[PDB]
Curated annotation (Swiss-Prot):
This is Costars family protein ABRACL. It holds the Pfam family Costars. The lineage of its organism: Eukaryota, Metazoa, Chordata, Craniata, Vertebrata. SMART domains: Costars. The modification N-acetylmethionine is found at residue 1. The gene is ABRACL. Belongs to the costars family. One of its GO terms (biological process) is regulation of actin filament-based process. Keywords: Acetylation. It comes from Homo sapiens (Human). Transmembrane segments: none annotated.
Length: 85
């Protein structure tokens, strides 16, 4: 409910759903994550959660705003990793 937790929830989910790109970092396509969220609704505000982590430079993804699933091929790239002990 507090987006502060959701950010870390996001990076964990990305750790499981995401696959490594050429840069060696984990990345997951919006369509894949959105697909899972459409079932459980983990992120009540997925876009806002993405924004939060993009502002923290934890993840990056092409696009500013979106409404339709035309950005589903957009890979959310994990730039900063704090998820794992």
């Amino acid at each position: 409910m507090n987006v502060d937790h959701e950010v870390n929830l996001l990076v964990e989910e990305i750790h499981r759903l995401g696959s490594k790109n050429a840069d060696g970092k984990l990345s997951v396509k919006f369509g894949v994550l959105f697909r899972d969220d459409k079932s459980a609704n983990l992120f009540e505000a997925l876009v806002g959660t993405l924004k939060a982590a993009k502002r923290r430079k934890i993840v990056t993804y092409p696009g500013e705003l979106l409404l339709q699933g035309v950005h589903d091929d957009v890979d959310i790239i994990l730039l900063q990793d704090l998820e794992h002990h």
